[model samples]
Target: GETTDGVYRVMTRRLLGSTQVGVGVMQEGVFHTMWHVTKGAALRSGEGRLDPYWGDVKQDLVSYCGPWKLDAAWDGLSEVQLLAVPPGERAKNIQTLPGIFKTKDGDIGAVALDYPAGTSGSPILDKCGRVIGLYGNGVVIKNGSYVSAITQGKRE
Candidate 1:
């Protein structure tokens, strides 16, 4: 099937100087993804480009996850759906419960669905298809995958 509306395949140079492939989503006309995806990249200045796969990529306003703290007692589990297109693959939708985990970047959201590589920056959607988080890391045997909560993100 074709990539869904609001979902995108992000292509950019990483901070380490390698071309990286990830995912992105459109919310209220603004493109959003994980900060790591655009961190130190040309996309931060709106100079980078995106490939929406099915349509022209929108470069007007791009946003990424920001800092936000969760309650100390919060359990970090929430039902959500992830939409992404892995490298050289079609888009997919997976349902899972994301938990909170600590990382060098800070505390991040995570899920147990073993999504493939290049799925980073995928949007974690709610039942209504609203983006609630951005998947950042690949699967880890111990903690699953990492995500950045949208509640802590700034929207343009």
Candidate 2:
């Protein structure tokens, strides 16, 4: 088994009877991932919850990889590393990119790294190893991978 920094593999059983696996990180004693990962998924204790009024998913999920602790913050750096566990693989992969940029929406972020499919929800760590954001699925621009800024997550 291989561990990549503080990143962990996250699995969710959707309400439609389908299961999805992605990456996740633990921050402020809570596990964090892309909102889409928890959408329509069965939620349990310590799995987080949904926003009652907003209809957005909250800290809802599990990471069976490790108890590795990492601090998160809201700052954009010139370079970062996208840590993930590719599908059907136990070893974690790290993708380093030159810089992070803003998406058209302005709220979400993007990196120049074309991470693998299952890399979504992975942690984006700065040079100092602090988690700056979470890797997201889909490409905003050619070769630009989507990411959710740590500030986007509701802090506990």
Candidate 3:
């Protein structure tokens, strides 16, 4: 378990653009969600659907990974951490993220990130199993790396 300083929620359902959900208390402090179209929605192509993704997987909603803080507009639509895929990937994902919709008419959506490739393909994992990054920065230059050293590269 981990501790955070802000409000948060976890996915209780696979909220596709094809599904609907309602909110209720599951545990003392945890909230559960209700479903609308549990059967899942049909994939429609138009102004607001994920046209195509890696391998033409056809995603319903665009997504990204983040540990982002809420900026001014907390109207429920939280800005999330994101990354562009390979080439056409970044542009497409960015466009689909904001325009994403839930099964209902007015439910906020979220983004999730996958493990980012890191040095030597060894990779790094954050507290939530998300990827972390390190590069050209004064602090990085001083602290070296996340795992091997706090001040310099450690010998393998």
Q: Model 3: what TM-score?
A: 0.17
140 in model 1: Cα distance from truth in Å?
3.5
Per-residue alpha-carbon lDDT of model 3 for 1-156, expressed as tens digits?
A: 322222122222354432212111112222111112111222222332211111111221111111111112212333322222221122112211222224354433333222222111111122342322211111122344221110111111
Index of the highest-lDDT prediction:
1
Q: Estimate the TM-score of every prediction.
A: 0.56, 0.56, 0.17
Winner by lDDT between candidate 3 and candidate 1: 1
Which consecutive 10 residues in model 3 have the weakest lDDT in total?
Answer: 147-156
**Candidate 1 C-alpha lDDT tens digits along 21-138:** 6777654445555544544343442554443211112211235332221112223565777676786678888877766666576676666555554676776677766666666544
**Deviation (Å) of 72 in candidate 2:** 4.4
Worst window of 10 by summed lDDT in candidate 1: 52-61
Per-model CA lDDT versus the true structure: 0.53, 0.51, 0.21
lDDT tens per residue, model 2, 25-55: 6554445566565553433434544222222
* Order of models, best lDDT first: 1, 2, 3
Model 1 misplaced stretches (Cα beyond 4 Å): 1-5, 12-20, 43-78, 102-109, 138-152
Among all windows of ten consecutive residues in candidate 2, which has the lowest summed lDDT? Answer: 50-59
